[PDB]
Amino acid sequence: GWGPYPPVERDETSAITYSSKLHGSVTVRDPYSQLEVPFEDSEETKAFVHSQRKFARTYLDENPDREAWLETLKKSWNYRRFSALKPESDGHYYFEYNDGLQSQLSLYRVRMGEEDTVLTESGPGGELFFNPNLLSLDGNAALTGFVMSPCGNYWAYGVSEHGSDWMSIYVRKTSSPHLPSQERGKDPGRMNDKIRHVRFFIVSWTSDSKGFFYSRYPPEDDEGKGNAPAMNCMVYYHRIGEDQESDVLVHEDPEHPFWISSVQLTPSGRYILFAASRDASHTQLVKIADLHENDIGTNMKWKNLHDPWEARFTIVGDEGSKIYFMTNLKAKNYKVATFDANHPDEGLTTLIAEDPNAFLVSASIHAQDKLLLVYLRNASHEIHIRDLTTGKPLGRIFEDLLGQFMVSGRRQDNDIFVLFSSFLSPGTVYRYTFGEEKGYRSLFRAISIPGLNLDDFMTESVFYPSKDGTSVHMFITRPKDVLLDGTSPVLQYGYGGFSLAMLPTFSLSTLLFCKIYRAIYAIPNIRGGSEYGESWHREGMLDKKQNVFDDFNAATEWLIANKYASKDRIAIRGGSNGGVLTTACANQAPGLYRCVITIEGIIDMLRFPKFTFGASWRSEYGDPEDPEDFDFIFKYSPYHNIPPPGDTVMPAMLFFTAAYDDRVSPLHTFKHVAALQHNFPKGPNPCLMRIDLNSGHFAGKSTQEMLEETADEYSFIGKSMGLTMQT
Ligand SMILES: *C(=O)[C@@H]1CCCN1C(=O)[C@@H]1CCCN1C(=O)OCc1ccccc1
């Protein structure tokens, strides 16, 4: 007797006709099309959001395990967190720090040579440089990025107010840190520079430290609460001390408003790379200019790097006229190649060949002539050292560590700081010093979590057959003392797309779920990701997207068949592209799943191109307005494939979405929740929408909101699957 669902107005006439290769045309009905109108523009959308919000709150709050979860999460989340040390041109190391339950990581610094005094029981040490929590009253304003002037006197930084893809760029002196005395709701100590209407932090200082390049868009009233396509990306140069109105236009392309464009300077500041993107594929239109020839503006001598739309190019470094690129040019797994700007017609020369069995994730220069490569092989990271001059192998480092690495250190430094993490390791900072034949490794600092004994857990590697017989890898994290007797709950997380690998990643909350509910945490490395190189992505996109859903369903069947999980206690979870996975799998195999968690899900696979950044995803999903693509998209589009109610028991489903979410428009969740509640008015399992009116994502917003969302998710799974919380 948790019902009834709040009513939702239907438009029974609303339909769009799509061209179809098989059927000539298909008229598709959308009775909830009015919920495409943003919250702030429609009283109907407002009434839907408020009624669904209130309904979900009432259901979630009637479970006593919700408060129990909130308390469990507050205790366990209260641990000291930090990044590796990042060396900067002002002669300081910078590091992120959280004392425990602050919304945003704070930026601390220490004089190079004094770093052995930081991150102790006494506290972070060094000096507090920047506290993003001070920027807002709610802790929802976040640092989107930062870059120091080459001179080391200035610091350019991005702030997004409500966690949307809108930010302003500020500048402050490196002599002007945030003082501890200062209170919330202000950014004291900044210079007057304010760069508005930015949607991504790609910022390059000129070597004269007089100004920086940036990308911006036309102004927008509904600041991240609109859902119009993101259009008319422009490159500008800002001179320090000038109003944004004086900024010089570097590039615009009015013919192609859907293109995204940015510039990047080589570390020397001599060469500028222009890159335009027309979709989510790893392909660019690229141009190089030599800043020793040009004054900044629309009068720069742009040179051809390579034919457009064949490859992506990222700067690794430069040596005079030679530029080092990480590129996928005739190499889908990426490689390192050099360009001589003095011989453009010779094109690119291979320095490090493509590895046919490993995705090259990053390439960086250290100790003058050591090339550090991070490879993704078999769904985890490997570090290889190469000679910059010859490309000759100089050996592996951190081979004994299975997980992922974040590498800090510049070409002029003999040292790197490497943050290692996995499903079981929250964060170990190693220091590595390059030598002639071998280096020196030391453990600098390790994150400890008082609230949880990590030795109680194990991560295994299994391989399971998908529907088509493809062998898929899965990671299984679990408590060592849990019996595989077919009674355990599972939390099964998937994404499957955009060459994004699900690599070993530390999540405290997930391990608390495993301990408290005696549960298994399953990460199937399904197609669409880069776990087995770029071909793994190709086998899970466009007309092969169904492979992703089949891989995920087969993972669940395997866990049940091999007694890892109860048939009655499978919870699946996914976000963004992961939401196509959760909603498709719920439609295609509702009987496998007891609980489905969808975070900012993409669900309407016909209408996705019409909103914010959606048109770029046509490279991944296909173009719904193309007759050939329409047929394979329409087969799985979860919004259009909700099972007929008479012979399906739909799982319990909880949808998270945000008001400022301009990445995936909330309308996806709005319409699907409306449709599910309409199809299954009597459940028996509830379909709920949990909305945050004050963020545009679910990480790097207020700790209060994050705790409540997690307490809602875990308490909802507990209720839906009939679980008891263990001490
Ligand atoms: C989440 O998975 C959504 C839905 C499908 C793909 N996607 C993304 O967020 C993709 C994947 C990586 C980044 N991305 C994206 O949309 O970036 C475009 C962009 C957004 C904001 C500024 C600049 C570019």
mmCIF file of N, CA, C and O in Angstrom, residues 428-487:
data_model
loop_
_atom_site.group_PDB
_atom_site.id
_atom_site.type_symbol
_atom_site.label_atom_id
_atom_site.label_comp_id
_atom_site.label_asym_id
_atom_site.label_seq_id
_atom_site.Cartn_x
_atom_site.Cartn_y
_atom_site.Cartn_z
ATOM 1 N N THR A 428 47.713 4.804 -2.678
ATOM 2 C CA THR A 428 49.130 4.776 -2.250
ATOM 3 C C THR A 428 49.912 5.693 -3.188
ATOM 4 O O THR A 428 49.909 5.432 -4.411
ATOM 5 N N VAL A 429 50.533 6.731 -2.628
ATOM 6 C CA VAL A 429 51.443 7.645 -3.375
ATOM 7 C C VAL A 429 52.858 7.066 -3.286
ATOM 8 O O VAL A 429 53.390 6.992 -2.166
ATOM 9 N N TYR A 430 53.395 6.596 -4.409
ATOM 10 C CA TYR A 430 54.820 6.203 -4.560
ATOM 11 C C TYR A 430 55.609 7.362 -5.165
ATOM 12 O O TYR A 430 55.064 8.096 -5.998
ATOM 13 N N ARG A 431 56.864 7.509 -4.758
ATOM 14 C CA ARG A 431 57.876 8.374 -5.408
ATOM 15 C C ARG A 431 58.792 7.452 -6.211
ATOM 16 O O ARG A 431 59.264 6.463 -5.638
ATOM 17 N N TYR A 432 58.992 7.733 -7.497
ATOM 18 C CA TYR A 432 59.944 7.000 -8.370
ATOM 19 C C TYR A 432 60.965 7.984 -8.949
ATOM 20 O O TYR A 432 60.561 8.983 -9.561
ATOM 21 N N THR A 433 62.249 7.700 -8.758
ATOM 22 C CA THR A 433 63.401 8.491 -9.268
ATOM 23 C C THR A 433 64.065 7.720 -10.409
ATOM 24 O O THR A 433 64.487 6.570 -10.177
ATOM 25 N N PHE A 434 64.153 8.327 -11.590
ATOM 26 C CA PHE A 434 64.761 7.710 -12.793
ATOM 27 C C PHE A 434 66.279 7.619 -12.618
ATOM 28 O O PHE A 434 66.888 8.573 -12.091
ATOM 29 N N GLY A 435 66.842 6.473 -13.001
ATOM 30 C CA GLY A 435 68.288 6.241 -13.058
ATOM 31 C C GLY A 435 68.714 5.885 -14.463
ATOM 32 O O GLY A 435 67.890 6.012 -15.376
ATOM 33 N N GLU A 436 69.967 5.454 -14.613
ATOM 34 C CA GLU A 436 70.595 5.099 -15.909
ATOM 35 C C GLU A 436 70.023 3.756 -16.376
ATOM 36 O O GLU A 436 69.459 3.731 -17.482
ATOM 37 N N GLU A 437 70.178 2.691 -15.578
ATOM 38 C CA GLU A 437 69.721 1.315 -15.933
ATOM 39 C C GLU A 437 68.479 0.907 -15.127
ATOM 40 O O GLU A 437 67.677 0.121 -15.652
ATOM 41 N N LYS A 438 68.357 1.374 -13.884
ATOM 42 C CA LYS A 438 67.148 1.177 -13.038
ATOM 43 C C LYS A 438 66.930 2.436 -12.193
ATOM 44 O O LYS A 438 67.869 3.226 -12.026
ATOM 45 N N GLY A 439 65.724 2.588 -11.657
ATOM 46 C CA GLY A 439 65.347 3.730 -10.809
ATOM 47 C C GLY A 439 65.292 3.324 -9.346
ATOM 48 O O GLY A 439 65.615 2.142 -8.995
ATOM 49 N N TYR A 440 64.741 4.247 -8.536
ATOM 50 C CA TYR A 440 64.512 4.056 -7.083
ATOM 51 C C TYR A 440 63.034 4.326 -6.772
ATOM 52 O O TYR A 440 62.545 5.434 -7.034
ATOM 53 N N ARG A 441 62.352 3.322 -6.225
ATOM 54 C CA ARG A 441 60.930 3.402 -5.812
ATOM 55 C C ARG A 441 60.870 3.485 -4.287
ATOM 56 O O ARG A 441 61.573 2.725 -3.635
ATOM 57 N N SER A 442 60.043 4.377 -3.748
ATOM 58 C CA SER A 442 59.685 4.401 -2.307
ATOM 59 C C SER A 442 58.180 4.656 -2.166
ATOM 60 O O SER A 442 57.589 5.310 -3.050
ATOM 61 N N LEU A 443 57.585 4.121 -1.104
ATOM 62 C CA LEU A 443 56.193 4.432 -0.688
ATOM 63 C C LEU A 443 56.228 5.764 0.069
ATOM 64 O O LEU A 443 56.827 5.813 1.141
ATOM 65 N N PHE A 444 55.666 6.822 -0.512
ATOM 66 C CA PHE A 444 55.652 8.181 0.080
ATOM 67 C C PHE A 444 54.567 8.251 1.153
ATOM 68 O O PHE A 444 54.912 8.502 2.309
ATOM 69 N N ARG A 445 53.294 8.070 0.780
ATOM 70 C CA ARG A 445 52.137 8.159 1.715
ATOM 71 C C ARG A 445 51.020 7.231 1.213
ATOM 72 O O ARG A 445 50.840 7.121 -0.020
ATOM 73 N N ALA A 446 50.303 6.592 2.142
ATOM 74 C CA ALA A 446 49.173 5.669 1.876
ATOM 75 C C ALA A 446 47.915 6.188 2.570
ATOM 76 O O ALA A 446 48.000 6.548 3.757
ATOM 77 N N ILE A 447 46.786 6.226 1.863
ATOM 78 C CA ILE A 447 45.463 6.540 2.480
ATOM 79 C C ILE A 447 45.076 5.352 3.371
ATOM 80 O O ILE A 447 45.215 4.201 2.914
ATOM 81 N N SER A 448 44.648 5.616 4.602
ATOM 82 C CA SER A 448 44.068 4.583 5.504
ATOM 83 C C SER A 448 42.609 4.926 5.830
ATOM 84 O O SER A 448 42.299 6.120 6.060
ATOM 85 N N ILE A 449 41.751 3.908 5.852
ATOM 86 C CA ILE A 449 40.313 4.035 6.222
ATOM 87 C C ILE A 449 40.105 3.312 7.551
ATOM 88 O O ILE A 449 40.048 2.088 7.592
ATOM 89 N N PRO A 450 40.067 4.058 8.679
ATOM 90 C CA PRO A 450 39.838 3.470 9.999
ATOM 91 C C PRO A 450 38.588 2.580 10.073
ATOM 92 O O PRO A 450 38.645 1.564 10.735
ATOM 93 N N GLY A 451 37.511 2.985 9.395
ATOM 94 C CA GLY A 451 36.173 2.371 9.487
ATOM 95 C C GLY A 451 36.076 0.969 8.897
ATOM 96 O O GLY A 451 35.081 0.287 9.229
ATOM 97 N N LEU A 452 37.034 0.531 8.067
ATOM 98 C CA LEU A 452 36.915 -0.759 7.329
ATOM 99 C C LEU A 452 38.258 -1.495 7.260
ATOM 100 O O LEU A 452 39.265 -0.853 6.950
ATOM 101 N N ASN A 453 38.258 -2.799 7.539
ATOM 102 C CA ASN A 453 39.445 -3.685 7.406
ATOM 103 C C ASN A 453 39.478 -4.230 5.977
ATOM 104 O O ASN A 453 38.706 -5.154 5.680
ATOM 105 N N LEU A 454 40.375 -3.701 5.146
ATOM 106 C CA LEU A 454 40.464 -4.029 3.697
ATOM 107 C C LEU A 454 40.946 -5.477 3.491
ATOM 108 O O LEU A 454 40.661 -6.043 2.425
ATOM 109 N N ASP A 455 41.594 -6.069 4.491
ATOM 110 C CA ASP A 455 42.107 -7.468 4.447
ATOM 111 C C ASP A 455 40.948 -8.471 4.491
ATOM 112 O O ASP A 455 41.196 -9.653 4.183
ATOM 113 N N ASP A 456 39.742 -8.030 4.871
ATOM 114 C CA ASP A 456 38.520 -8.878 4.914
ATOM 115 C C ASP A 456 38.002 -9.145 3.494
ATOM 116 O O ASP A 456 37.126 -10.000 3.352
ATOM 117 N N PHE A 457 38.527 -8.438 2.492
ATOM 118 C CA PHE A 457 38.034 -8.456 1.095
ATOM 119 C C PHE A 457 39.079 -9.077 0.163
ATOM 120 O O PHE A 457 40.278 -9.045 0.460
ATOM 121 N N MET A 458 38.588 -9.637 -0.941
ATOM 122 C CA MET A 458 39.400 -10.161 -2.060
ATOM 123 C C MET A 458 38.741 -9.735 -3.378
ATOM 124 O O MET A 458 37.509 -9.548 -3.411
ATOM 125 N N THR A 459 39.556 -9.564 -4.412
ATOM 126 C CA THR A 459 39.113 -9.321 -5.803
ATOM 127 C C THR A 459 39.574 -10.508 -6.647
ATOM 128 O O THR A 459 40.789 -10.788 -6.621
ATOM 129 N N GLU A 460 38.663 -11.178 -7.345
ATOM 130 C CA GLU A 460 39.061 -12.252 -8.288
ATOM 131 C C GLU A 460 38.782 -11.798 -9.723
ATOM 132 O O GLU A 460 38.129 -10.761 -9.945
ATOM 133 N N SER A 461 39.377 -12.535 -10.652
ATOM 134 C CA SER A 461 39.270 -12.411 -12.121
ATOM 135 C C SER A 461 38.628 -13.692 -12.646
ATOM 136 O O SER A 461 39.222 -14.776 -12.445
ATOM 137 N N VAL A 462 37.449 -13.574 -13.259
ATOM 138 C CA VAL A 462 36.755 -14.711 -13.932
ATOM 139 C C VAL A 462 36.485 -14.334 -15.389
ATOM 140 O O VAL A 462 36.540 -13.124 -15.725
ATOM 141 N N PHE A 463 36.267 -15.347 -16.226
ATOM 142 C CA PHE A 463 35.884 -15.192 -17.654
ATOM 143 C C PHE A 463 34.608 -15.998 -17.897
ATOM 144 O O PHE A 463 34.574 -17.183 -17.481
ATOM 145 N N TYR A 464 33.600 -15.387 -18.526
ATOM 146 C CA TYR A 464 32.267 -16.001 -18.754
ATOM 147 C C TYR A 464 31.867 -15.854 -20.220
ATOM 148 O O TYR A 464 32.171 -14.838 -20.845
ATOM 149 N N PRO A 465 31.193 -16.864 -20.813
ATOM 150 C CA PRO A 465 30.723 -16.767 -22.196
ATOM 151 C C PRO A 465 29.503 -15.845 -22.317
ATOM 152 O O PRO A 465 28.582 -15.995 -21.562
ATOM 153 N N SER A 466 29.538 -14.908 -23.265
ATOM 154 C CA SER A 466 28.359 -14.093 -23.661
ATOM 155 C C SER A 466 27.492 -14.930 -24.601
ATOM 156 O O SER A 466 27.915 -16.037 -24.975
ATOM 157 N N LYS A 467 26.314 -14.409 -24.947
ATOM 158 C CA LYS A 467 25.323 -15.069 -25.839
ATOM 159 C C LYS A 467 26.015 -15.599 -27.106
ATOM 160 O O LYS A 467 25.707 -16.720 -27.502
ATOM 161 N N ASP A 468 26.930 -14.835 -27.710
ATOM 162 C CA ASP A 468 27.585 -15.183 -29.002
ATOM 163 C C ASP A 468 28.858 -16.012 -28.771
ATOM 164 O O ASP A 468 29.559 -16.281 -29.760
ATOM 165 N N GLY A 469 29.164 -16.389 -27.523
ATOM 166 C CA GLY A 469 30.320 -17.247 -27.184
ATOM 167 C C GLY A 469 31.586 -16.457 -26.870
ATOM 168 O O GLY A 469 32.568 -17.067 -26.437
ATOM 169 N N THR A 470 31.585 -15.144 -27.100
ATOM 170 C CA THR A 470 32.703 -14.239 -26.718
ATOM 171 C C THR A 470 33.000 -14.415 -25.223
ATOM 172 O O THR A 470 32.063 -14.349 -24.398
ATOM 173 N N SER A 471 34.270 -14.637 -24.897
ATOM 174 C CA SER A 471 34.770 -14.728 -23.507
ATOM 175 C C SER A 471 34.907 -13.306 -22.959
ATOM 176 O O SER A 471 35.698 -12.527 -23.523
ATOM 177 N N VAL A 472 34.147 -12.976 -21.910
ATOM 178 C CA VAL A 472 34.157 -11.623 -21.277
ATOM 179 C C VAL A 472 34.813 -11.728 -19.895
ATOM 180 O O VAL A 472 34.496 -12.662 -19.146
ATOM 181 N N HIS A 473 35.714 -10.806 -19.577
ATOM 182 C CA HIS A 473 36.366 -10.746 -18.249
ATOM 183 C C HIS A 473 35.421 -10.056 -17.268
ATOM 184 O O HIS A 473 34.741 -9.115 -17.683
ATOM 185 N N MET A 474 35.410 -10.515 -16.015
ATOM 186 C CA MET A 474 34.679 -9.856 -14.905
ATOM 187 C C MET A 474 35.561 -9.870 -13.652
ATOM 188 O O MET A 474 36.161 -10.920 -13.354
ATOM 189 N N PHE A 475 35.644 -8.727 -12.968
ATOM 190 C CA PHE A 475 36.194 -8.595 -11.595
ATOM 191 C C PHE A 475 35.069 -8.855 -10.591
ATOM 192 O O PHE A 475 33.955 -8.317 -10.783
ATOM 193 N N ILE A 476 35.358 -9.649 -9.557
ATOM 194 C CA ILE A 476 34.426 -9.922 -8.431
ATOM 195 C C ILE A 476 35.152 -9.592 -7.122
ATOM 196 O O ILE A 476 36.042 -10.366 -6.725
ATOM 197 N N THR A 477 34.754 -8.491 -6.479
ATOM 198 C CA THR A 477 35.191 -8.114 -5.115
ATOM 199 C C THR A 477 34.144 -8.614 -4.111
ATOM 200 O O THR A 477 32.937 -8.413 -4.346
ATOM 201 N N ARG A 478 34.593 -9.248 -3.031
ATOM 202 C CA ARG A 478 33.704 -9.826 -1.993
ATOM 203 C C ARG A 478 34.452 -9.995 -0.679
ATOM 204 O O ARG A 478 35.681 -10.035 -0.670
ATOM 205 N N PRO A 479 33.725 -10.090 0.456
ATOM 206 C CA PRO A 479 34.332 -10.480 1.726
ATOM 207 C C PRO A 479 34.788 -11.944 1.616
ATOM 208 O O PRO A 479 34.117 -12.713 0.948
ATOM 209 N N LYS A 480 35.940 -12.273 2.205
ATOM 210 C CA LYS A 480 36.587 -13.605 2.090
ATOM 211 C C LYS A 480 35.714 -14.686 2.744
ATOM 212 O O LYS A 480 35.783 -15.844 2.300
ATOM 213 N N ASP A 481 34.929 -14.323 3.761
ATOM 214 C CA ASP A 481 34.166 -15.284 4.609
ATOM 215 C C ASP A 481 32.726 -15.440 4.104
ATOM 216 O O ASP A 481 31.969 -16.185 4.733
ATOM 217 N N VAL A 482 32.351 -14.798 2.997
ATOM 218 C CA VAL A 482 31.013 -14.990 2.359
ATOM 219 C C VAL A 482 31.041 -16.326 1.604
ATOM 220 O O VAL A 482 31.942 -16.521 0.762
ATOM 221 N N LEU A 483 30.092 -17.220 1.899
ATOM 222 C CA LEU A 483 29.941 -18.506 1.177
ATOM 223 C C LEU A 483 29.328 -18.222 -0.197
ATOM 224 O O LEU A 483 28.352 -17.443 -0.287
ATOM 225 N N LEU A 484 29.893 -18.835 -1.232
ATOM 226 C CA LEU A 484 29.271 -18.919 -2.573
ATOM 227 C C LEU A 484 28.286 -20.098 -2.567
ATOM 228 O O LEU A 484 28.604 -21.141 -3.142
ATOM 229 N N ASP A 485 27.134 -19.918 -1.912
ATOM 230 C CA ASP A 485 26.092 -20.956 -1.704
ATOM 231 C C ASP A 485 24.788 -20.515 -2.381
ATOM 232 O O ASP A 485 23.749 -21.127 -2.103
ATOM 233 N N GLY A 486 24.851 -19.480 -3.217
ATOM 234 C CA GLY A 486 23.726 -19.007 -4.042
ATOM 235 C C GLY A 486 22.739 -18.172 -3.251
ATOM 236 O O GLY A 486 21.591 -18.090 -3.700
ATOM 237 N N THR A 487 23.150 -17.561 -2.134
ATOM 238 C CA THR A 487 22.252 -16.757 -1.256
ATOM 239 C C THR A 487 22.650 -15.273 -1.259
ATOM 240 O O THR A 487 21.826 -14.469 -0.850
#
